[PDB]
């Protein structure tokens, strides 16, 4: 793979909106990133806790899968797990800002539950 793969992987897995935006563009153009041989497989939120109100967290889950799978492939998972989990939480919170009142609180509560369900592993 290219020499800057570790840096590209870091850039796609930060908690910032710009990192998520960069990853989203790559996700839509995976073939353009073929040289990097990233693991683009994801189960979306199928292995996550219940989502009774149906908030659209699929993309949040997808980027979290990307972070986990690729850092595990690089053999440096334990040291990056925290940031990946946090980025996941931030991605979900971004979704929630689109709601007000009860919905906003319910959305943030579901986001917290999802985050805690992965944080339990370490």
Q: Which of these, 62, 89, 64, 93, lies nearest to 77 by C-alpha position?
A: 64
Q: Which one is catalytic: 64, 70, 87, 108?
A: 64
Is 80 marked active-site? no
The verdict on whether residue 65 carries a ligand-binding annotation is yes
Taking a C-beta distance cutoff of 8 angstroms, is the pair 68, 34 a contact? no
Cα distances (Å, whole numbers) of residue 33 to 59, 64, 82: 18, 18, 25
- The boundaries of the domain holding residue 108 are 1-122
Q: What is the 3-state secondary structure (H, E, C) of the chain?
A: CCCCHHHHHHHCCCCCHHHHHHHHHHHHCHHHHHHHCCCCCCCCCCCCCCCCCCCCCHHHHHHHHHHHHHHHHCCCCCCCHHHHHHHHHHHHHHHHCCCCHHHHHHHHHHHHHHHHHHHCCC
The verdict on whether residue 85 carries a ligand-binding annotation is no
The verdict on whether residue 44 carries a ligand-binding annotation is yes
Taking a C-beta distance cutoff of 8 angstroms, is the pair 33, 104 a contact? no
Taking a C-beta distance cutoff of 8 angstroms, is the pair 66, 42 a contact? yes
Tokens standing for 122? Answer: 């370490």
Taking a C-beta distance cutoff of 8 angstroms, is the pair 22, 16 a contact? no
Q: What is the CATH number of the domain that holds 17?
A: 1.20.90.10
Total count of residues recorded for the chain: 122
Q: Between 81-96 and 17-28, two packed helices, what is the crossing angle to 10 degrees? A: 90
Q: Which of these, 51, 78, 48, 53, lies nearest to 65 by C-alpha position?
A: 48
Domain count, the chain: 1
């Amino acid at each position: 793979a290219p020499a800057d793969k570790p840096q590209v992987l870091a850039s796609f897995t930060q908690t910032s909106a710009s990192s998520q935006n960069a990853w989203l563009a790559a996700n839509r153009n995976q073939s353009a990133w073929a040289a990097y041989e990233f693991d683009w497989s994801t189960d979306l939120c199928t292995q996550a806790p219940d989502n009774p109100f149906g908030f659209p967290f699929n993309t949040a889950c997808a980027r979290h899968d990307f972070g986990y799978r690729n850092y595990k492939a690089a053999g440096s998972f334990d040291a990056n797990k925290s940031r990946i989990d946090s980025a996941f939480y931030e991605d979900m919170k971004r979704v929630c800002t689109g709601y007000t009142g009860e919905k906003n609180t319910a959305c943030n509560s579901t986001a917290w539950t999802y985050y805690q369900a992965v944080k339990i592993f370490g």
